[PDB]
Amino acid sequence: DELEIIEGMKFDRGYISPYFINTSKGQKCEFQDAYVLLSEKKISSIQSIVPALEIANAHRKPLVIIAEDVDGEALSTLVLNRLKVGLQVVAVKAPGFGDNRKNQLKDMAIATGGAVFGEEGLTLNLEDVQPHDLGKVGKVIVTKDDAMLLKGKGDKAQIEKRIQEIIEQLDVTTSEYEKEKLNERLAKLSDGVAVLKVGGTSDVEVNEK
Amino acid sequence: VDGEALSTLVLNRLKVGLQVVAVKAPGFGDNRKNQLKDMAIATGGAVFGEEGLTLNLEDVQPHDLGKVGK
Amino acid sequence: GQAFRKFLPLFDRVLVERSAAETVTKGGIMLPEKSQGKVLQATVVAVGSGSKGKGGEIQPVSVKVGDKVLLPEYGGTKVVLDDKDYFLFRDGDILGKYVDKLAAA
Amino acid sequence: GQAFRKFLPLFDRVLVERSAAETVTKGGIMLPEKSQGKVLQATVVAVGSGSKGKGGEIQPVSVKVGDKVLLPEYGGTKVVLDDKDYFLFRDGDILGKYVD
Amino acid sequence: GQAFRKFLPLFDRVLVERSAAETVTKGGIMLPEKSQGKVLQATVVAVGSGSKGKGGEIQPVSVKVGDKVLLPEYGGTKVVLDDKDYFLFRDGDILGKYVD
Amino acid sequence: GQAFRKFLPLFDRVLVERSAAETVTKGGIMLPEKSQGKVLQATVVAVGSGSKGKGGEIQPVSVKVGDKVLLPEYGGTKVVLDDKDYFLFRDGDILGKYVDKL
């Protein structure tokens, strides 16, 4: 048996490009006191991405970008400014399903303090950002496979509101789709959840135990 | 209630706490008309949308259309 | 012909600033940024020398700078000066002028 | 050229007010406010200086202000004035004048 | 009418050099050379004799050489002189001249 | 108006020799439009009398024979003389003349 305790914001998506790597040991990009940008839409274009980087270089902080995808010319700006004037940026794919992604990115928005870009209703566009529209996190670690965000700052009342919302969701939720728990574990992290990995030498043993 | 209307309702709800709420009609085809006339007559008068006697949503008055309590 | 922000429009062209469209409607209630159209009220800020045609001599444009004017919803090209938005129209395309003074009382 | 409600139409253009649409037609029978619809009779309320193109000199528009006139069903652009609806047409587009 | 790099544009046509576009915008952040555009500021470098029309005598083009000028985003055709890129427009198509 | 290989172009028309056209293929491979060939360099070899219009008298064409000239990528129609390829353009369609003397 092993007890693992998770706290933070973990999800299974990795940097889009190898050029983002910072550590050379492990091949990770490791950041602290970072900003986070959250885009519900794809980021291909330049004109939507650039102010978000100017605002980052202004306040001399590393930037993590989470999006449906980041590619076209945007990615080119990202790894050019990364490779030539050691700017601290990474870009990663949205946790990814379809309609689930909206709740996940809005979760990360609420946790890290800040707002999601792209179309919900009231649309905030990527061209007009302010530092209070981003996100702020104690630490960030990214690999080829997975992304972890740590010590994100936001309204604790509003986050506990969020968890109170998801539990009251799942409890009445005649569902074979357990991702609501996968959501709930995330927004509970850095308050925390404990996973109990049970051992044994054979499946039947593992199930009885 | 959706499109641009809902967009006005929120975000403008999130402003110097004025209270608005919007809800779907009890619904289900031809029944909803009879239900809305019920709530109309109950709160005392109420008509909008297509018609017997036609009242349009652009032309409202403070005595409209029925009232109310809680 | 007279210019604006170091920009002189050519032949028939008139440059105008669209006056900012309403965010707080009547009484006190604000509306979302998508519900506004292109706003069709505009002040003119620059003017071309005029159209050489309908003669042999140049014919000057029918509006003076600083006039309030009513645009059509179509047929106009955006230009940006000092990171601000202005719009460029043919003199013929403009529909109406708002007037500065009354005749009788 | 003459104007209306601080609005002067340019070159060829004429501004008109559409005259109010029928509620008790012919047989004594009333109609709903949605049943029509753009009215093709209109009184002129403003006029442009005229079209520069028809010589070297300006040619003034063929209608004077305050005339009753018959519009086409398609052309012309809506304008709103404090806070009422008026419509704007080219002088050529207008079909007819009512005389008196 | 006046020419450039042994090239004289004909009738109404104007030849211009597009002035080199931004690599380091505003703040401090660099951009890829082709990213998503054509730059719409350009200096004129050659000029045609004129269109001759609207009369019987030639009418010269409305811009002189060496003016700063604002192009439209669609028209004009590319031409290459001494392995460098220049662009060719009708005099009417040009939107604006920059004054000192 | 002056002619070439027993061919005289009419009204507004100019006959020109184009330096080889095909850009769409290289060698054996296909190419993506670059501005692949928006503009052709060519020397003029024949000329029409001129366009009767803008007056009552004929107005002669704006280029003389033997000039170097820049064609548009579109418009012109092929003609063949002594089994060689030449191309025919309107005087208006021509974009530019190359000059020979500062």
UniProtKB/Swiss-Prot annotation, chain B:
Modification N6-acetyllysine, positions: K15, K37
Signal peptide start-end: none
Domain of life: Eukaryota
In-chain residues carrying the UniProt-annotated modification N6-succinyllysine: K24
Intracellular or extracellular location(s): Mitochondrion matrix
Entry's family note: Belongs to the chaperonin (HSP60) family.
Disease implication from the record: Spastic paraplegia 13, autosomal dominant: A form of spastic paraplegia, a neurodegenerative disorder characterized by a slow, gradual, progressive weakness and spasticity of the lower limbs. Rate of progression and the severity of symptoms are quite variable. Initial symptoms may include difficulty with balance, weakness and stiffness in the legs, muscle spasms, and dragging the toes when walking. In some forms of the disorder, bladder symptoms (such as incontinence) may appear, or the weakness and stiffness may spread to other parts of the body. Leukodystrophy, hypomyelinating, 4: A severe autosomal recessive hypomyelinating leukodystrophy. Clinically characterized by infantile-onset rotary nystagmus, progressive spastic paraplegia, neurologic regression, motor impairment, profound intellectual disability. Death usually occurs within the first two decades of life.
Protein task: Chaperonin implicated in mitochondrial protein import and macromolecular assembly. Together with Hsp10, facilitates the correct folding of imported proteins. May also prevent misfolding and promote the refolding and proper assembly of unfolded polypeptides generated under stress conditions in the mitochondrial matrix. The functional units of these chaperonins consist of heptameric rings of the large subunit Hsp60, which function as a back-to-back double ring.
Designated name of the protein: 60 kDa heat shock protein, mitochondrial
Organism (species): Homo sapiens
Gene this protein is translated from: HSPD1
Residues of the full protein shown: 278 to 347 of 573
Curated annotation (Swiss-Prot), chain C:
GO molecular function, one term: RNA binding
Keywords, sorted A to Z: Acetylation, Chaperone, Mitochondrion, Phosphoprotein, Stress response
Domain of life: Eukaryota
Modification Phosphothreonine occurs at: T77
Biological process annotations from GO: chaperone cofactor-dependent protein refolding; intrinsic apoptotic signaling pathway; osteoblast differentiation; protein folding; response to unfolded protein
InterPro entries: Chaperonin_GroES, Chaperonin_GroES_sf, Chaprnonin_Cpn10_CS, GroES-like_sf
PTM annotation (N6-acetyllysine): residues: K6, K38, K54, K64, K68, K78, K84, K97
Induction section of the entry: By stress.
Keyword field contains ATP-binding: no
Residue numbers carrying N6-succinyllysine: K26, K38, K52, K54, K64, K68, K78, K84
CDD domains: cpn10
Record's subcellular location: Mitochondrion matrix
PANTHER family named in the record: 10 KDA HEAT SHOCK PROTEIN, 10 KDA HEAT SHOCK PROTEIN, MITOCHONDRIAL
Function noted in UniProt: Co-chaperonin implicated in mitochondrial protein import and macromolecular assembly. Together with Hsp60, facilitates the correct folding of imported proteins. May also prevent misfolding and promote the refolding and proper assembly of unfolded polypeptides generated under stress conditions in the mitochondrial matrix. The functional units of these chaperonins consist of heptameric rings of the large subunit Hsp60, which function as a back-to-back double ring.
Similarity comment: family membership: Belongs to the GroES chaperonin family.
Subunit structure: Homoheptamer arranged in a ring structure. 2 heptameric Hsp10 rings interact with a Hsp60 tetradecamer in the structure of a back-to-back double heptameric ring to form the symmetrical football complex.
Protein name, UniProt field: 10 kDa heat shock protein, mitochondrial
Record organism: Homo sapiens
Gene that encodes it: HSPE1
Curated annotation (Swiss-Prot), chain F:
Similarity-based family: Belongs to the GroES chaperonin family.
Residue(s) carrying N6-acetyllysine: K6, K38, K54, K64, K68, K78, K84, K97
GO MF, any single term: metal ion binding
Any Pfam family: Cpn10
Protein location: Mitochondrion matrix
Function: Co-chaperonin implicated in mitochondrial protein import and macromolecular assembly. Together with Hsp60, facilitates the correct folding of imported proteins. May also prevent misfolding and promote the refolding and proper assembly of unfolded polypeptides generated under stress conditions in the mitochondrial matrix. The functional units of these chaperonins consist of heptameric rings of the large subunit Hsp60, which function as a back-to-back double ring.
Matches recorded under PANTHER family: 10 KDA HEAT SHOCK PROTEIN, 10 KDA HEAT SHOCK PROTEIN, MITOCHONDRIAL
Gene3D superfamilies documented for this protein: GroES chaperonin (2.30.33.40)
Protein name: 10 kDa heat shock protein, mitochondrial
PROSITE patterns linked to this entry: CHAPERONINS_CPN10
Any single GO CC term annotated in Swiss-Prot or TrEMBL for this entry: mitochondrial matrix
InterPro entries in the cross-refs: Chaperonin_GroES (IPR020818), Chaperonin_GroES_sf (IPR037124), Chaprnonin_Cpn10_CS (IPR018369), GroES-like_sf (IPR011032)
Transmembrane segments: none
Record flagged with keyword Kinase: no
Residues annotated with Phosphothreonine modification: T77
Top-level taxon: Eukaryota
Modification N6-malonyllysine, positions: K38, K52, K54
